[PDB]
Amino acid sequence: IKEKGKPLMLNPRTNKGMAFTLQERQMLGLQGLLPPKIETQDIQALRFHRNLKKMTSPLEKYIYIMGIQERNEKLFYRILQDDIESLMPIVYTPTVGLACSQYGHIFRRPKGLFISISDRGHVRSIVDNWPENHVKAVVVTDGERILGLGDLGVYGMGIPVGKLCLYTACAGIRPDRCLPVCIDVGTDNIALLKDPFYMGLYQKRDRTQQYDDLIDEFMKAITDRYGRNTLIQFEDFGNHNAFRFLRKYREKYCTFNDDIQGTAAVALAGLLAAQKVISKPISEHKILFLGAGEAALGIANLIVMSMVENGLSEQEAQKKIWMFDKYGLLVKGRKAKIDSYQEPFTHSAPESIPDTFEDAVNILKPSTIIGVAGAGRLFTPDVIRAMASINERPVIFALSNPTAQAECTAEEAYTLTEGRCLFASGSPFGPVKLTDGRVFTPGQGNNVYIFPGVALAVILCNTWHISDSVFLEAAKALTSQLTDEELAQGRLYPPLANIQEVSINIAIKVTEYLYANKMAFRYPEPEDKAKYVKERTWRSEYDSLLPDVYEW
Amino acid sequence: HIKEKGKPLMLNPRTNKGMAFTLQERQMLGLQGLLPPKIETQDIQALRFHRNLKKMTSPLEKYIYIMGIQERNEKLFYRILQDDIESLMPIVYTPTVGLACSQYGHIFRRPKGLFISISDRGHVRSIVDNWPENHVKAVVVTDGERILGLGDLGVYGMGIPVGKLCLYTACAGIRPDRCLPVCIDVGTDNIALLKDPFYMGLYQKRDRTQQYDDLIDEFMKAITDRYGRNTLIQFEDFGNHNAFRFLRKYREKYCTFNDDIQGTAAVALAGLLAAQKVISKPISEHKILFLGAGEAALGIANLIVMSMVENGLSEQEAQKKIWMFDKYGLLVKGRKAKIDSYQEPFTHSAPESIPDTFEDAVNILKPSTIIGVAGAGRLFTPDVIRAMASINERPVIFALSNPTAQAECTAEEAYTLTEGRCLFASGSPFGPVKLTDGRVFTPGQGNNVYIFPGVALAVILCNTWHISDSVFLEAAKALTSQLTDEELAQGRLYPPLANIQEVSINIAIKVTEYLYANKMAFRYPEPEDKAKYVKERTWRSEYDSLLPDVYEW
Amino acid sequence: HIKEKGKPLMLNPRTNKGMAFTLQERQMLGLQGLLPPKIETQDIQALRFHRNLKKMTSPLEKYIYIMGIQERNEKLFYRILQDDIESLMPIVYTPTVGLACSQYGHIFRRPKGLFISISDRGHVRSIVDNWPENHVKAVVVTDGERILGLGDLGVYGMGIPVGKLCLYTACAGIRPDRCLPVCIDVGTDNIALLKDPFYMGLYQKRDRTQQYDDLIDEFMKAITDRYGRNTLIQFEDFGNHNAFRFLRKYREKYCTFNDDIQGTAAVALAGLLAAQKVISKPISEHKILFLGAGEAALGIANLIVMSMVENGLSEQEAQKKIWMFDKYGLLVKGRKAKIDSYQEPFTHSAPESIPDTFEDAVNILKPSTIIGVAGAGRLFTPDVIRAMASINERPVIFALSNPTAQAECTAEEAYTLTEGRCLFASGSPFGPVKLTDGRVFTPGQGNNVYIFPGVALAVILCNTWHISDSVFLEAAKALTSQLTDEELAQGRLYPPLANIQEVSINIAIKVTEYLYANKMAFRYPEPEDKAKYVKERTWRSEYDSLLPDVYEW
Numbered sequence A: 001i002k003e004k005g006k007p008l009m010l011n012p013r014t015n016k017g018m019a020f021t022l023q024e025r026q027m028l029g030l031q032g033l034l035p036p037k038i039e040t041q042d043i044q045a046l047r048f049h050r051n052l053k054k055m056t057s058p059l060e061k062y063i064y065i066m067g068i069q070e071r072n073e074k075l076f077y078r079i080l081q082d083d084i085e086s087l088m089p090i091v092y093t094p095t096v097g098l099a100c101s102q103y104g105h106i107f108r109r110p111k112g113l114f115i116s117i118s119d120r121g122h123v124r125s126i127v128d129n130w131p132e133n134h135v136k137a138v139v140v141t142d143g144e145r146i147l148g149l150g151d152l153g154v155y156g157m158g159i160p161v162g163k164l165c166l167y168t169a170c171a172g173i174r175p176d177r178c179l180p181v182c183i184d185v186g187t188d189n190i191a192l193l194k195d196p197f198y199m200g201l202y203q204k205r206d207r208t209q210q211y212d213d214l215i216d217e218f219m220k221a222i223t224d225r226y227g228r229n230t231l232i233q234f235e236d237f238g239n240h241n242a243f244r245f246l247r248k249y250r251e252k253y254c255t256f257n258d259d260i261q262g263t264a265a266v267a268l269a270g271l272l273a274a275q276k277v278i279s280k281p282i283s284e285h286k287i288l289f290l291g292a293g294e295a296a297l298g299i300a301n302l303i304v305m306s307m308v309e310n311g312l313s314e315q316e317a318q319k320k321i322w323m324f325d326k327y328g329l330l331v332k333g334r335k336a337k338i339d340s341y342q343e344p345f346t347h348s349a350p351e352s353i354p355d356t357f358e359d360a361v362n363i364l365k366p367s368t369i370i371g372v373a374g375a376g377r378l379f380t381p382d383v384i385r386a387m388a389s390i391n392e393r394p395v396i397f398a399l400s401n402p403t404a405q406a407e408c409t410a411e412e413a414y415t416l417t418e419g420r421c422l423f424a425s426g427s428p429f430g431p432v433k434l435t436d437g438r439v440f441t442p443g444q445g446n447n448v449y450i451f452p453g454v455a456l457a458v459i460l461c462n463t464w465h466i467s468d469s470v471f472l473e474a475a476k477a478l479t480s481q482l483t484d485e486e487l488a489q490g491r492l493y494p495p496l497a498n499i500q501e502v503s504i505n506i507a508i509k510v511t512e513y514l515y516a517n518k519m520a521f522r523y524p525e526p527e528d529k530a531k532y533v534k535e536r537t538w539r540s541e542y543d544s545l546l547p548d549v550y551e552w
Numbered sequence B, C: 001h002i003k004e005k006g007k008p009l010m011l012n013p014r015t016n017k018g019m020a021f022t023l024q025e026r027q028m029l030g031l032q033g034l035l036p037p038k039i040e041t042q043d044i045q046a047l048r049f050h051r052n053l054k055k056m057t058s059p060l061e062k063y064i065y066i067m068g069i070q071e072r073n074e075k076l077f078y079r080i081l082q083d084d085i086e087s088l089m090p091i092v093y094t095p096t097v098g099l100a101c102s103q104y105g106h107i108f109r110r111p112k113g114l115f116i117s118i119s120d121r122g123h124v125r126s127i128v129d130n131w132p133e134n135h136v137k138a139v140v141v142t143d144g145e146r147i148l149g150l151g152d153l154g155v156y157g158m159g160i161p162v163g164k165l166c167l168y169t170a171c172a173g174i175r176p177d178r179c180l181p182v183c184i185d186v187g188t189d190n191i192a193l194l195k196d197p198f199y200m201g202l203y204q205k206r207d208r209t210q211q212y213d214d215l216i217d218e219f220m221k222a223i224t225d226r227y228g229r230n231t232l233i234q235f236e237d238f239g240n241h242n243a244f245r246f247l248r249k250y251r252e253k254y255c256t257f258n259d260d261i262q263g264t265a266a267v268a269l270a271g272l273l274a275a276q277k278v279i280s281k282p283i284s285e286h287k288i289l290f291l292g293a294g295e296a297a298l299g300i301a302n303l304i305v306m307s308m309v310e311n312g313l314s315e316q317e318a319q320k321k322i323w324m325f326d327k328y329g330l331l332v333k334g335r336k337a338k339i340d341s342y343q344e345p346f347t348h349s350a351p352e353s354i355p356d357t358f359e360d361a362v363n364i365l366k367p368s369t370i371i372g373v374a375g376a377g378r379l380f381t382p383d384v385i386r387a388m389a390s391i392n393e394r395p396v397i398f399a400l401s402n403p404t405a406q407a408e409c410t411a412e413e414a415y416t417l418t419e420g421r422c423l424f425a426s427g428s429p430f431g432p433v434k435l436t437d438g439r440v441f442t443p444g445q446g447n448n449v450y451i452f453p454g455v456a457l458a459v460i461l462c463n464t465w466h467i468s469d470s471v472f473l474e475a476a477k478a479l480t481s482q483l484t485d486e487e488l489a490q491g492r493l494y495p496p497l498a499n500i501q502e503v504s505i506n507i508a509i510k511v512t513e514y515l516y517a518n519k520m521a522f523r524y525p526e527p528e529d530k531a532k533y534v535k536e537r538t539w540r541s542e543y544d545s546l547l548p549d550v551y552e553w
């Protein structure tokens, strides 16, 4: 450290609080600025857990926890490590959605970097104002699709912040390497345009060429300063923007879209867990999507990929996937629009065309339904019953976030199918106990299981581009951790409590893959990939700040 | 002008404006992108705070929130306090500060002052040199032995100096960067705190050896060696034995007063003088009974004596009108319970019947004014109050013990049980009391917050070197002289807390006029307009421009 | 963009522009008033420097002045060097750097690199972490045992790494903030320096135990642990024993070369190849006699062998054409004086008469080329030169020892005593020589300054991990291929120092083309235009704008 005195306490990266040793206090001029008491991290973690028990509302817990990030960074990640299953719903979905919805009302300090359309031509100067020099990972949003909550504008910054908290908490990616970015080009959210506390420009979303040119400039500005292999994770962008940006940049920059590719990886891993229980033939698979956007087309393309990898044709796989959007079932000649990514999953109309999603369950008789509409409880009791009628063990994935936007609950799923269904949710549900005393612990089909492990590997390997097949390996490495006990309880994913261990093992496997496929440019290639990744994880343990005094 | 730019301007609460950093400021000082594109006014920030607060329940949750602002955006903190000081005084000051000190270590996020332990001994100078501010003018110091009526809280007592200096700035516009809260940690005799794993002081019993005196000496020297021999040092919540002997040892050697003796003396008297204006009771017929013979008791009594002496009476026949009743019973000549030097002048020949209870002391001595400063709970019982309503047409009842739980009685039971005839003041805030007959009594708060800001400002601006007991007499006069007829007519013996800013400045003005008149001011030259002089040197909560001066040649 | 403003921008020579700080820059960055109202161009600053210099006498006074600039205004320093590198090369480099190192401690004002002593042992990491620059790409390191021909100068030798890295930037446009000069102090065997009170190293004799190897190891690890395993480490002036065993121990384990072996090998060869172009002497008839069998001797010999081997000859019959004559006399099989591993291939069966002097070795062996690398003075005597002019129509005479005093002979006495028939190169600079018959010979300087910049730039930009002897062979080819006919026609066996910038960049370009072709480059992606790639990444001496980006919304 180059600074001494009070600045060590005002900088949350360095502030240890009362856990500054007596030597550190004397040698760095902190003596008297701290109480005479000298604490351990274990005492601070305890103080935190005592105060958290007295708190009632999840938002109040979010303001407290996220407050600690701006006061004592080490302690922030220590309390996250202490019980991440407990705190995931608070720092992440669903509470982060509540946080974003009124970000401007709970604001205390900015977090991450803000690039506005008014800053077009000057984005380098902005990027140059970020104090950290060795940034390896960027999570960026323009706030247009923040979960199922729609266009929240600059309020969307809460999502990148949450994502990069989990980079560190799960994978042990260095916080000071992490850069959360919000692109502000306006918002079409009229409620926010008359909110006097809104933190963005008071304008409707700029959709001219200035938009595309701004994202170009942001991409050039980031890599110019930090490195051409700088990982840029796109999050909660609008459908149209999500896709064309992913394709326009995936060959030019080290990028991926968490909502398309990250979701695809966690969904499949869930379906591969389900298929290990069911053990049905790969020919008797009809997958029906509620929603035909980022998450739908993403998951679909990666299913096809593992089906092609595991037996049948590419054209055989696409006829097995069906999609029902806002306008009706995706069928050739339908009056409503079809984009180029929806083409492979749009089919010639069947005998009768469904009006509602329940009619589509009965007509198509699918073995698995997946909900990514962000449109609320559309896996109605009838849809769930009909799905349990048609299948001995139906697969119901209600992945939409947050909880209110979810297609159905864990209880609704396990009850109406009499404990037959294999269930995963995007937002976390607790264990379900049915009338006959059977306990079902639902798994969370959320891209939190992927993006950390993937990100760490891509960084540590100095990888330049991320193919769809990297998300296949993560999908395989996630399910390859699920034990027989955990699946006997109905979990299609390992427990959220072990997501650290899971994300590390995923990074190791994705590391091995990237090296074996000439995608790693970190010379020299390490022998023990396990020990390589494990000895490079950031730790929440306080470091020594004492200068090296010695001998002569 | 600022010496630093970039992220450090936001990490420093002295300089952080949040989204009130102008576009130009963001671009020139390298903040562009580090803040949301939104540019805000303090008015918008202020409004964000109030909507958040309306909306919390527990007073302690409000304390953690408001005091949090002081470590994020200092300007906004004081703007918040200024917007509605009466609302927030209960939260930042008595009683909620007591609740906060009682678990200071359970709610700790950042330190908020200078900590000088008994281990830090012979090295106090280097610790004072670790304080980042160069021009400190005002120290409030405690050892935590007498935090309100909550007794020995040790380092947990730091909450009190912090609160006091927030009010230096909020009431008198004394500059925060010139303010230094200090906690002297010599251990605590509070066994509950020694068993608490979150305690912030040394895990040891209160050191009462020579080393305690040697440490306070070294502190007084270290502070004045760095910041100046006329650096204001306010002693707060030190506990009877130490408060007095330190006041006397240092009052002529440094620029130092004890707030719990002299401050509370001045506000009590100002309350008694406001009471005199409605009663007009002949001076000879006055009789004051104190519940307690401690710091506040003896402080208030010495300023009453001085006021009586100034108005005709002699020292001896003024002291004869003051009785005191401590934990061992009434104070009379040759009792089993001890009588210290300061208590002797008020220890009189035993009456006919020596009372065992305080109610007996009322019915015997038949006092006109009753002052409670015991910190021992609800000792002004309904029967104590009734007896006062019987003996006196207009009984004066000052229940000054803090916090609210330790007060001798409420406003409710004072105004009720005297049939709205009493003249009442509390130490801790009470709301207006409506009696069955429809009359609405608004109780005034006899708390030293009405004194220490104005006096402190005057002393600082006048470069005063030593504070006489006579300054506090002038403070009391200055304070009561601002009480309007209409406010005295609703039962207020003090101006409302809502106006404590202008009251505090007016006190400061009057005290500077006095300090100059009596050749106690050492600021050259003497200004012509003392009102204009004080008013133009008050710190403002309005954001300063941080823009470099850019101009054409 | 800069992180700091105010006086610190002037106290840091990396950022100080002096009066070239624009009005806007002064006002926004808080420099207004700290600088004279005058605003200047680098052209005016440059002009101020040259008028001051024209006008000093002693070379050492010029060295103290120019090297002073590097610690005041770095941009201006390199601008100065760039304006006229040929003029100032004698002052900042050989020979005046030798004079400077010989009394480095008498002229000391500021330190100019990283000092790692044998006392600093097991703690080398913390010392490397004290260097304020985060992105070091190029280290030049010495232990001071072999500073030029001046031998063991200890810490006084630090002058040499400083000089080398100034030329990294001046010649190859390698970024100064990425450059780290290092001095390893393990004591000195120089008794004169141990008696000097101004000596800058430990007052102890050169430690030659295991701890010396353990320290160099720890240095190699500490540097690469912080800055990267492919961090270029140039070994300079280490002394025969250590130079070779460290080169071999580390050449395949780190990105490291020895400049006094491999650099001087490449420039010597480039000189010999330029000589071949005018003589066209059949390969079989070549015979090279070295005065010295040290670092430079063995380095140059190994690159000659490789060039001959590439052009048809075998290893054995190439080595048979190289003879060496050290301090003990000629090197032949089974002599009293020792023969180390690296010397064996060149140690041949004794001729008819074993010479006692070097002149005898010429008259016996009748060599076509004579190379002096003894650092032992004027050993190429008039009779040595005459004998060469007799034996050879066009004798090749390379007097490469540095500095000027230690050179084997001058240009004057080479061109004179061979009647302007010799092909000559010096290690230290000589002016043009006009003979009585009117012909004017311009001597070229066979000095490794022509190699280490270009090679270093290539290695850095190509992210090369290990340097093969073959890279230096390509450097030699690249260097001589820039020698024009007109320059070779005035007696230059090297391009002029005036053009060393573009020569150094062209070397770098050619070496990058080679490193990529032979899969030694690890910078992804491979660029299409290698010339454009190198040229667009050179550091420029032109001031950068330090203005915050201010713009309207």
Ligand SMILES: NC(=O)c1ccc[n+]([C@@H]2O[C@H](COP(=O)([O-])OP(=O)(O)OC[C@H]3O[C@@H](n4cnc5c(N)ncnc54)[C@H](O)[C@@H]3O)[C@@H](O)[C@H]2O)c1
Pocket: A145, A146, A147, A148, A238, A239, A258, A259, A260, A263, A266, A290, A291, A292, A293, A294, A295, A296, A324, A325, A326, A327, A371, A372, A373, A374, A375, A378, A399, A400, A401, A402, A405, A425, A426, A427, A445, A446, A447, A448
């Ligand atoms: N669990 C996870 O890890 C994860 C990851 C990414 C996205 N999601 C969630 O998926 C949901 C949508 O994500 P997206 O990025 O695909 O959004 P999107 O805009 O790309 O896609 C929405 C799709 O759903 C359709 N739809 C909307 N309302 C409908 C209705 N009532 N009936 C039928 N179809 C309807 C739309 O027409 C569109 O095709 C959100 O709730 C989001 O938070 C979850």
Ligand SMILES: NC(=O)c1ccc[n+]([C@@H]2O[C@H](COP(=O)([O-])OP(=O)(O)OC[C@H]3O[C@@H](n4cnc5c(N)ncnc54)[C@H](O)[C@@H]3O)[C@@H](O)[C@H]2O)c1
Pocket: B146, B147, B148, B149, B150, B239, B240, B259, B260, B261, B264, B267, B291, B292, B293, B294, B295, B296, B297, B325, B326, B327, B328, B372, B373, B374, B375, B376, B379, B400, B401, B402, B403, B406, B426, B427, B428, B446, B447, B448, B449
């Ligand atoms: N309103 C104000 O401005 C203000 C200022 C200072 C102190 N106070 C309050 O006054 C109280 C005491 O302050 P202090 O510094 O004088 O304390 P202190 O320690 O100096 O003395 C307390 C006195 O009360 C007596 N006492 C204790 N218990 C008693 C009982 N049951 N019956 C009768 N007497 C009893 C003690 O013997 C002693 O004489 C505290 O609650 C404090 O918060 C209020």
Ligand SMILES: NC(=O)c1ccc[n+]([C@@H]2O[C@H](COP(=O)([O-])OP(=O)(O)OC[C@H]3O[C@@H](n4cnc5c(N)ncnc54)[C@H](O)[C@@H]3O)[C@@H](O)[C@H]2O)c1
Pocket: B137, B173, B174, B175, B178, B460, B461, B462, B463, B523, B536, B537, B538, B539
């Ligand atoms: N137009 C105006 O508003 C106006 C006019 C004249 C002076 N001033 C102010 O007065 C100051 C001049 O200082 P000076 O050195 O001549 O001493 P001074 O004579 O003005 O003040 C006397 C002492 O009180 C201190 N002091 C003044 N204001 C204070 C505050 N708000 N909080 C704490 N301490 C305070 C000073 O540091 C000094 O030690 C300037 O900072 C200036 O802002 C303002």
Ligand SMILES: NC(=O)c1ccc[n+]([C@@H]2O[C@H](COP(=O)([O-])OP(=O)(O)OC[C@H]3O[C@@H](n4cnc5c(N)ncnc54)[C@H](O)[C@@H]3O)[C@@H](O)[C@H]2O)c1
Pocket: A133, A134, A136, A172, A173, A174, A177, A459, A460, A461, A462, A522, A536, A537, A538, C134, C135, C224, C225, C226, C227, C228, C229
């Ligand atoms: N970032 C810079 O500009 C900079 C400056 C000085 C030195 N260095 C580097 O320091 C290196 C020493 O270790 P290393 O980085 O090579 O280890 P490494 O090569 O094993 O690390 C591989 C990559 O992942 C990054 N990385 C390692 N641990 C990480 C973590 N916990 N979170 C996020 N990213 C992580 C590294 O920065 C590197 O880019 C040198 O190789 C040198 O190149 C970098």
Ligand SMILES: NC(=O)c1ccc[n+]([C@@H]2O[C@H](COP(=O)([O-])OP(=O)(O)OC[C@H]3O[C@@H](n4cnc5c(N)ncnc54)[C@H](O)[C@@H]3O)[C@@H](O)[C@H]2O)c1
Pocket: C146, C147, C148, C149, C150, C239, C240, C259, C260, C261, C264, C267, C291, C292, C293, C294, C295, C296, C297, C325, C326, C327, C328, C372, C373, C374, C375, C376, C379, C400, C401, C402, C403, C406, C426, C427, C428, C446, C447, C448, C449
């Ligand atoms: N021009 C250049 O680029 C360049 C590069 C490196 C070294 N040099 C110079 O070459 C000289 C030696 O360098 P080195 O590293 O090879 O030194 P070294 O210590 O490796 O060896 C010097 C050699 O010269 C021999 N020698 C010494 N005195 C002699 C004498 N009187 N007669 C014959 N031989 C004698 C020694 O025995 C030894 O073989 C130094 O002056 C040095 O400055 C020049």
Ligand SMILES: NC(=O)c1ccc[n+]([C@@H]2O[C@H](COP(=O)([O-])OP(=O)(O)OC[C@H]3O[C@@H](n4cnc5c(N)ncnc54)[C@H](O)[C@@H]3O)[C@@H](O)[C@H]2O)c1
Pocket: A227, A228, C137, C173, C174, C175, C178, C460, C461, C462, C463, C523, C536, C537, C538, C539
């Ligand atoms: N138009 C232009 O002039 C232009 C175009 C492209 C890049 N650049 C420059 O190239 C750099 C990009 O760096 P990168 O991280 O992509 O590595 P890189 O691939 O450009 O360079 C390869 C290695 O050489 C180093 N390097 C480059 N120039 C150097 C110098 N002058 N001195 C010392 N070391 C040097 C780098 O740090 C890196 O380790 C930028 O700093 C930029 O100024 C300039």
Ligand SMILES: O=C(O)/C=C/C(=O)O
Pocket: A107, A108, A109, B017, B018, B019, B045, B046, B048, B049, B069, B072, B073, B076
């Ligand atoms: O409204 C603000 O800018 C800051 C609020 C806070 O720090 O609480």
Ligand SMILES: O=C(O)/C=C/C(=O)O
Pocket: A016, A017, A018, A019, A044, A047, A067, A068, A071, A072, A075, B108, B109, B110
């Ligand atoms: O206990 C600490 O040191 C910090 C606590 C917090 O920031 O809340």
Ligand SMILES: O=C(O)/C=C/C(=O)O
Pocket: C108, C109, C110
């Ligand atoms: O500045 C100088 O000239 C010398 C400094 C020193 O000897 O330390």
Ligand SMILES: O=C([O-])C(O)C(=O)[O-]
Pocket: A093, A146, A147, A148, A236, A258, A259, A400, A401, A426, A446, A447
């Ligand atoms: O953050 C998430 O959980 C996911 O990316 C989503 O958009 O629903």
Ligand SMILES: O=C([O-])C(O)C(=O)[O-]
Pocket: B094, B147, B148, B149, B160, B237, B259, B260, B401, B402, B427, B447, B448
């Ligand atoms: O702080 C106070 O309100 C007072 O000084 C007391 O001690 O009660």
Ligand SMILES: O=C([O-])C(O)C(=O)[O-]
Pocket: C094, C147, C148, C149, C160, C237, C259, C260, C401, C402, C427, C447, C448
């Ligand atoms: O520095 C030089 O010129 C050369 O490396 C030498 O050692 O003579």
Ligand SMILES: [Mg+2]
Pocket: A147, A235, A236, A258, A259
């Ligand atoms: Mg998302």
Ligand SMILES: [Mg+2]
Pocket: B148, B160, B236, B237, B260
């Ligand atoms: Mg008090």
Ligand SMILES: [Mg+2]
Pocket: C148, C160, C236, C237, C260
């Ligand atoms: Mg050398």
